[PDB]
Each structure stands twice: as C-alpha cells, then as structure tokens.
Amino acid sequence: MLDQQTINIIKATVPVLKEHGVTITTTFAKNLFAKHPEVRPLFDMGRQESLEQPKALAMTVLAAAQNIENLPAILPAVKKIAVKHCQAGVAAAHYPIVGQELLGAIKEVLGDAATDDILDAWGKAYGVIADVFIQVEADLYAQAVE
Amino acid sequence: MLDQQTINIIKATVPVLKEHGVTITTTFAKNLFAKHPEVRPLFDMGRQESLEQPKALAMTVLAAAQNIENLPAILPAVKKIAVKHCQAGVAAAHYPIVGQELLGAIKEVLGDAATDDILDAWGKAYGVIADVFIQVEADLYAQAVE
Numbered sequence: 280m281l282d283q284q285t286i287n288i289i290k291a292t293v294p295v296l297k298e299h300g301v302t303i304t305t306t307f308a309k310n311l312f313a314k315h316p317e318v319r320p321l322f323d324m325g326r327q328e329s330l331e332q333p334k335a336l337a338m339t340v341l342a343a344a345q346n347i348e349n350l351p352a353i354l355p356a357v358k359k360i361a362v363k364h365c366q367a368g369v370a371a372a373h374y375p376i377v378g379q380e381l382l383g384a385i386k387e388v389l390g391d392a393a394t395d396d397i398l399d400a401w402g403k404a405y406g407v408i409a410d411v412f413i414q415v416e417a418d419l420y421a422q423a424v425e
Numbered sequence: 426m427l428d429q430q431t432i433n434i435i436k437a438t439v440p441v442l443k444e445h446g447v448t449i450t451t452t453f454a455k456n457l458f459a460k461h462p463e464v465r466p467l468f469d470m471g472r473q474e475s476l477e478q479p480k481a482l483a484m485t486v487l488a489a490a491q492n493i494e495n496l497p498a499i500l501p502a503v504k505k506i507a508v509k510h511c512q513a514g515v516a517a518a519h520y521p522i523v524g525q526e527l528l529g530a531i532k533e534v535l536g537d538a539a540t541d542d543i544l545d546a547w548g549k550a551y552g553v554i555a556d557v558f559i560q561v562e563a564d565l566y567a568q569a570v571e
C-alpha cells in the first residue's frame with residue numbers, strides 16, 4: 280500500500296509522464312522485446328505493428344497509476360485484462376520484468392526530470408497495481424484447474 | 426482489494442456493528458482466549474482487566490474498516506501497532522485465527538442481522554486490513570535481523 284507522501288508524488292508527476300507518453304511506452308516496448316526476447320511469443324508478432332500491444336500495456340499502467348486512489352472503480356477493467364493474461368499464460372514472475380523495464384523507460388525518456396525519489400514512487404505504485412492483477416489471475420487460474 | 430459492491434456493504438453495516446460494539450469486542454475477546462488459549466501469553470494477563478487489550482484489537486479492526494477507502498490516512502497508526510506486534514512476536518499465521526473469531530463474534534452478537542452476504546464482506550475487509558499489517562510487520566522483522 281502507498282503512503283500519502285508517495286501518492287502525492289504520483290499525483291504531481293503523472294502529467295509529466297503523460298506529456299511524454301508515446302515516447303515512454305514506445306521505449307518500454309522496444310526495450311522489453313530487445314532485452315527479454317523470451318516474452319515475444321506471448322504477444323501478436325504481426326510484421327508491421329508489433330509494438331502496439333506492449334505500448335498499450337505501459338499506457339494502461341500509467342492510467343491505473345493516475346487512478347491509484349480509486350482502483351475499485353477500475354477493477355472491472357483489470358478483470359477483463361486478467362482473462363487475456365491468463366489465456367496468454369502470464370505468470371506472477373513476469374511482473375518484476377515488466378516493472379523494471381517500465382521504470383527504465385521512464386528514466387530513459389524523462390532524463391533528469393525523473394529523480395530517484397520520483398522513480399522510487401513509481402516503482403511502489405507499479406507494485407500495488409501488479410499485486411491486484413496477480414491476485415485476480417491467481418484465482419482465475421485456480422478456478423480452471425480445480 | 427475490495428470491489429465497490431463489497432465496499433458499499435461495509436459502509437451500510439459499520440453503524441450496525443458500532444451500535445453493538447462493546448458486545449462484539451467483549452465476545453471476541455472471551456471467545457479468543459477460550460478457544461485459542463495459546464495466544465494468552467502474548468497479552469498482559471493482569472487479574473481484573475485482562476480483556477481490555479483484545480477488546481481494543483477488535484475495536485480497531487472495526488475502526489479501520491470504517492476507514493477502508495482511506496487506509497493511507499491511518500498508516501501511521503498501523504505502523505505504531507506493528508512495532509508492538511513485532512515486539513510481542515505476532516506472526517502472519519495468527520491473522521486468520523483472529524479473523525475467524527471476529528467474524529464469529531459478529532454473527533454471535535448480531536444474530537439474523539448478520540447475513541451471509543454481510544459476513545462475507547466483513548471477511549474480505551478483514552483480509553485487506555490484515556494484509557497491510559502483515560506487510561509492515563514482515564519488513565520490520567527483516568530490518569531487525571539483517
């Protein structure tokens with residue numbers, strides 16, 4: 280769970296990230312497929328627009344973060360994505376890889392505007408968001424096997 | 426995390442529980458020490474007022490639940506309690522025992538006013554609250570050993 284100070288940092292910086300949003304998500308997607316090529320097969324690798332799915336991944340993290348004090352209002356969105364995640368075989372162990380690369384992309388694009396304090400706050404926000412997905416997906420996986 | 430429907434149930438029933446608050450917490454305390462006598466030594470078993478600590482335990486759960494959509498505002502209270510929990514040697518495995526007995530006490534006192542749907546919602550709220558304590562305490566324990 281986030282403390283108020285961390286929430287305030289997210290609130291203050293979400294608009295900076297969104298101003299650079301296409302560049303962050305595009306950098307994330309490129310870095311993810313270049314540094315972790317093992318995740319490529321899980322996505323649709325159509326020749327031209329092969330970055331659109333991982334760009335939307337990163338963009339949705341940013342959108343969930345801007346909504347971090349009302350995650351219950353977006354739980355129905357989280358559940359729809361979870362079904363797709365479970366059908367693609369996304370595992371809890373994938374989530375730290377994605378978080379690492381997203382934080383890396385934010386620093387790569389924002390430069391000195393992404394301080395250690397700001398990156399730490401985004402890291403904590405990502406963890407809270409990921410934990411919701413992991414739990415929903417764990418339950419869905421358990422329903423399908425029992 | 427709670428969904429909105431569950432949050433609404435907690436919001437609607439917290440005042441019913443508080444109207445019976447002394448009776449719920451007293452019943453919880455008696456049942457806890459009678460059905461799980463192994464937890465007795467962790468508390469202060471002074472002759473007369475030996476129920477005041479576990480009554481305050483239950484009352485604070487109810488207070489956290491009424492604040493379940495702003496847990497960040499009570500995190501400083503959670504941290505102070507966590508230090509006491511860690512000094513008493515409270516373990517993650519204690520939390521389902523306490524939740525079981527608190528839900529049992531709520532049903533015992535409220536009777537037919539505590540429906541299955543209401544009890545299920547209080548069970549989910551307890552889990553979210555306990556998870557915050559467990560995480561804070563896990564970190565504190567790790568600081569003291571490393």
Ligand code: HEM
Nearest residue numbers: 318321322332335336339340360363367369373374377409
């Ligand atoms: C951390 C929070 C995450 C969020 C908010 C999120 C969000 C999304 C969204 C919105 C989509 C739909 C994309 C679209 O159809 O346009 C998606 C799809 C997908 N994501 Fe996630 N994701 C997260 C984590 C992950 C992780 C850790 C992986 C692991 C590789 C992952 C892999 C996938 C895959 C394989 C798809 C399938 C594409 C599709 O069917 O649309 N996602 N994710």
Ligand code: HEM
Nearest residue numbers: 464467468478481482485486506509513515519520523555
């Ligand atoms: C589930 C959420 C819980 C909450 C909100 C909570 C709350 C509290 C509070 C407010 C106190 C201080 C009591 C006072 O001094 O008046 C306390 C103390 C204590 N609680 Fe917890 N508690 C929880 C879980 C537990 C659990 C699972 C145990 C396991 C047995 C536990 C055992 C203790 C003990 C041994 C004390 C020491 C009494 C003291 O130093 O005051 N608590 N708890």
